[PDB]
Amino acid sequence: PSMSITRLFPALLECFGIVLCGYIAGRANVITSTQAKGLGNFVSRFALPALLFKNMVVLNFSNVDWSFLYSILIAKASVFFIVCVLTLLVASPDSRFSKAGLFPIFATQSNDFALGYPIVEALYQTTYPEYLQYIYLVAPISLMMLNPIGFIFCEIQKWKDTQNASQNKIKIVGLGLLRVLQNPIVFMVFIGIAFNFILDRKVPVYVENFLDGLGNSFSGSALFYLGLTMVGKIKRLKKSAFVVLILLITAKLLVLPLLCREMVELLDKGDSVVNHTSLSNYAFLYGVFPVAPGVAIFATQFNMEVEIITSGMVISTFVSAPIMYVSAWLLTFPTMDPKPLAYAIQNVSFDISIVSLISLIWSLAILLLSKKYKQLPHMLTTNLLIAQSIVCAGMMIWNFNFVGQILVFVLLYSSLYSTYLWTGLLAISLFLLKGKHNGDSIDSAFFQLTRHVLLCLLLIIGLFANLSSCLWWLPGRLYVELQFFCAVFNFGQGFISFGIFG
């Protein structure tokens, strides 16, 4: 296997569990916003620059696959160019430059170090250890190349807003370029590259432990700070702003990884098909990383589009977790024989039902302890979420004799079909308010008002799959992929119930 895909769910649990820890700490006022800045300044000014310096000094530039960098970088430049040109065409005259600066940086700049690296490490540390290098190459080179352009557009806006001024272009270009130079990521990569040549790849033995201590502290500390900064950030956006945010998160989490995968396949004219495939799959995985928290920091510094950029960075972080898991497994399935593939979809189902059961217990606990379950539409919703919890427990049981199998099936498919029933009954309440057994097998199938609208929309968008999937077993490539998307939905429907009511 090219990806150690089994290691991805443990790594996602590290990543988004530590982000959830920081979010819980901020929500519980264990760490207030003014206290969080100590972790943020530790992370950004000490742990991250030490991690960057360490890895840049160690880096074997004579063994880097430059065509991977070129590919991801051209893919990011493509999404940057598309989002920028399109924004200048679509946006209102008084704010087209603040948007044309921050929207392209949003759509291209990844959460490479905090979230990307634990995931790339998990997937590729053993199978393709060279892939861990390109986190430290891509992320800064792409800030260096793309961010000054977006900063230049924000400086143009700052100039334009300052209507009493009429000054010349070179201060605009210089000030935006100076802004990327002042980023620790950029200057520590220049410094680390310099010391890579000076020291060879060898960190001095007496400095090594110090850089290890700071660098190794970045991962958890940065994920936790990301959690803290996500508290109270999703402000209720206008309809247009929410559409723009959806477009930009789609640019980052769908268009960019598709273009990354395509660019690798265009430019990586090396021979080995497995190396080419794993590099293509890594390019996709790279594109799926959420928006860098630094973009929200730039937006705060300029005082421009900060609502959309912060909300979008938070939502991108959350939305990346399932997209990353789903994408990586989906890219691994082409390499798997049908028996390991059936195993794999049950592993996927177990993983999603773990997170969904946790999310459902929390959602139910809120709706029950708040006693909201007696009001409308919460009266129906709590039925749906109990039924979803029974679904997830059914899968965690099914992951671990013949009589138990038949019993656990009826638990799972009475509650599953019931969750579809409640999905429809719940949607309707918003409108009013306004074949044979097959025991010798591993898979199981073949035997408030506005927020509630969003839940029923997403759940109905999910519903397609287990409809088709069972009449089609009564096949081929798209069946095992939609078997996966209906398993994802069967067990992960509660995660959407949670993401909206938690």
Q: Which residues bind ligand IAC (CB under 6 A)?
A: 43-44, 48, 111-114, 222, 225-226, 292-294
Burial of 365 (0-12, 13-18, 19+ CB in 10 A): exposed
Taking contact as CB under 8 A, which single stretch among the options 27-35, 85-93, 383-391, 438-446 is the one that binds a second copy? 27-35
Minimum separation from the CB atom of position 125 to a second copy (A): 12
What does the block give as tokens for 244? 């723009």
Minimum separation from the CB atom of position 15 to a second copy (A): 8
Positions 119 through 138 that interact with a second copy (CB under 8 A): 122
Whether 451 has a binding-site annotation, put simply, is: yes
Binds 48, which of ligand IAC, a second copy, none (CB < 5 to 8 A, cut-off by type)?
A: ligand IAC
Is residue 299 a contact residue for a second copy (CB under 8 A)? no
State the residue for tokens 């649990």.
13
Q: Rank residues 46 and 446 by Cβ distance to a second copy and give the closer one.
A: 46
Contact pick of 219, 310, 363, 466 for a second copy (by CB under 8 A): 219
Angle between the N-to-C axes of helices 378-398 and 477-500, in degrees from 0 to 180, rounded to the nearest 10: 130
DSSP-derived letter for residue 435 is -
Cα angle 272, 278, 283 (rounded to 5 degrees) comes to 125
Q: Rank residues 13 and 376 by Cβ distance to a second copy and give the closer one.
A: 13
Distance between CA 229 and CA 22 in Å, rounded?
8
Whether 282 has a binding-site annotation, put simply, is: no
Whether 233 has a binding-site annotation, put simply, is: yes
Q: 3-class secondary structure for 107-171?
A: HHCECHHHHHHHHHHHHHCCCCHHHHHHHHHHHHHHHHHHHHHHHHHHHHHHHHHCCCCCCCHHH
Whether 297 has a binding-site annotation, put simply, is: no
Contact pick of 3, 9, 364, 456 for a second copy (by CB under 8 A): 9
Is residue 220 a contact residue for a second copy (CB under 8 A)? yes
Q: Rank residues 83 and 228 by Cβ distance to ligand IAC and give the closer one.
A: 228
User: Comparing C-alpha atoms, which of 286, 272, 248, 247 is closest to residue 74?
Assistant: 286
Which distant-in-sequence residues (6+ apart) come within 8 Å of 434 by Cβ? 449
Helices and strands, number each (H, E), in the chain:
20, 0
Is residue 347 a contact residue for a second copy (CB under 8 A)? no
Binds 149, which of ligand IAC, a second copy, none (CB < 5 to 8 A, cut-off by type)?
A: none
Distance between CA 470 and CA 454 in Å, rounded?
27
Q: Rank residues 288 and 456 by Cβ distance to ligand IAC and give the closer one.
A: 288
Q: Is the Cβ–Cβ distance between 236 and 41 less than 8 Å?
A: no
Distance between CA 486 and CA 39 in Å, rounded?
40
Minimum separation from the CB atom of position 45 to a second copy (A): 6
Whether 477 has a binding-site annotation, put simply, is: no
Q: Rank residues 43 and 445 by Cβ distance to ligand IAC and give the closer one.
A: 43
Is residue 3 a contact residue for a second copy (CB under 8 A)? no
Minimum separation from the CB atom of position 494 to a second copy (A): 18
Distance between CA 222 and CA 40 in Å, rounded?
7
Contact pick of 2, 5, 23, 39 for a second copy (by CB under 8 A): 39
Distance between CA 298 and CA 109 in Å, rounded?
12
Q: Is the Cβ–Cβ distance between 385 and 364 less than 8 Å?
A: yes
Positions 195 through 214 that interact with a second copy (CB under 8 A): 205-210, 212-214
Positions 234 through 273 that interact with a second copy (CB under 8 A): none
Q: What is the DSSP string of 472-494?
A: HH---HHHHHHHHHHHHHHHHHH
Minimum separation from the CB atom of position 256 to ligand IAC (A): 15
Is residue 417 a contact residue for a second copy (CB under 8 A)? no
What letter represents residue 43's amino acid? V
Whether 400 has a binding-site annotation, put simply, is: no
Q: Rank residues 183 and 388 by Cβ distance to ligand IAC and give the closer one.
A: 183
- Residues annotated in a binding site: 9, 23, 232-234, 451
Residues that constitute the known binding site for cholesterol = 9, 23, 232-234, 451
Residues in contact with a second copy by the rule CB under 8 A: 7, 9-11, 13-15, 17-18, 21, 25, 30-32, 34-42, 45-47, 118, 122, 205-210, 212-221, 223-224, 228, 351, 354
